[PDB]
DNA sequence: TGACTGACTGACTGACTGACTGACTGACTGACTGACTGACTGACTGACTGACTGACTGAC
């Protein structure tokens, strides 16, 4: 079809979703839509996870392109706040800034959302203790035994990456 | 039935780390660097040596 929807991928239900490359397949907007559908039909909070703090413009770069595809429901963009049908459930999450994470109470999020996972020829100033950072986040949110999933996508097929 | 608001707020900067790149270099080393005891034996030598001269008798 045109834009594959990842439900068949989600069928296996392992938490780690290693999707690689796929420039322009619509995994970006599928992983935008999916938590919105989950919050609408069940009531699960969602958090758009990036790596750094300085990006604030992603108030509108995440949510506009997927706002219209929903036919008959209401959406509100309030900066770091995301509202679906007048219910506040979405916020941006920086990884470089970890400390604000350790103060913030965890919203109940079924699946963490993340594409552009790989760094291609960056300045190499990524997050130190990177795999340890992801482990610390996973322990931090849902310290109970309730299961939590994660979706992570890389721009290009880098066969080996730190995780 | 309302009119600034005082404390949350987008944001939009204002100062600062390291990572990576752009030449030194002085550190390090290797390929000369011309000497310097050894070989040794090419040339040199006294040390050591075996057969011709030297004739009054064996013989007369
Ligand atoms: N719900 C949707 N409604 C409309 N178009 C969609 C939807 N989901 C995906 N797409 C399409 O998906 C295409 C690819 O856009 P992205 O979602 O950014 O792809 P992407 O797969 O994240 O690329 P990568 O892998 O991150 S480099 C766009 O042209 C959209 O039209
Ligand atoms: Mg993407």
Cα gyration radius (Å): 16 Å
Oligomeric organization of the protein chains: part of a larger assembly
Ligands in the model, by name, code or SMILES, are: phosphothiophosphoric acid-adenylate ester, magnesium ion
Strand order of the largest sheet: 2-5-4-3
Content-based structural category: alpha/beta
Helical percentage: 10-25%
What is the tally of helical segments? 5
Biggest sheet: strands, sense, closure?
Answer: 4 strands, mixed
Number of strands: 7
Report the portion of residues in β strands. 15-25%
Distance between the termini: 31 Å
In one word, what is the shape? globular
Binding site for ATP: 21-28
Protein name: DNA packaging protein
GO molecular function: ATP binding; ATP hydrolysis activity; DNA binding; RNA binding
Family: Belongs to the phi29likevirus gp16 family.
Structure overview:
It is built from five helices and seven strands. The protein starts with 6 loop residues before the first helix and ends in a 10-residue tail after the last strand. It has a four-stranded mixed sheet. Strands 1-7-6 form a three-stranded parallel sheet, covered by helices on one side. The chain is globular, with a radius of gyration of 16 Å. Strand 6, helix 5 and strand 7 form a beta-alpha-beta unit. The structure holds phosphothiophosphoric acid-adenylate ester (AGS) and magnesium ion (MG). Magnesium ion (MG) binds next to helix 2. The chain binds one DNA strand of 60 nucleotides through loops.
């Amino acid at each position: 079809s045109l834009f594959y929807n990842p439900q068949k991928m989600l069928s296996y239900d392992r938490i780690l979703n290693f999707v690689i490359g796929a420039r322009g397949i619509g995994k970006s907007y599928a992983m935008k839509v999916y938590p919105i559908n989950r919050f609408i039909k069940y009531g699960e909070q969602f958090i758009y996870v990036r790596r750094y703090k300085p990006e604030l413009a992603k108030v509108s770069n995440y949510f506009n392109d997927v706002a219209q595809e929903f036919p008959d429901h209401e959406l509100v963009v309030k900066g770091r706040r995301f509202y679906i049908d007048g219910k506040l459930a979405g916020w941006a999450i920086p990884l470089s800034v970890w400390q604000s994470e350790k103060s913030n109470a965890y919203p109940n999020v079924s699946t963490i959302v993340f594409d552009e996972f790989i760094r291609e020829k960056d300045n190499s100033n990524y997050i130190p203790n990177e795999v340890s950072a992801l482990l610390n986040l996973m322990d931090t949110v849902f310290r109970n035994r309730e299961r939590v999933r994660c979706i992570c996508l890389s721009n290009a097929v880098s066969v080996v990456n730190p995780y």
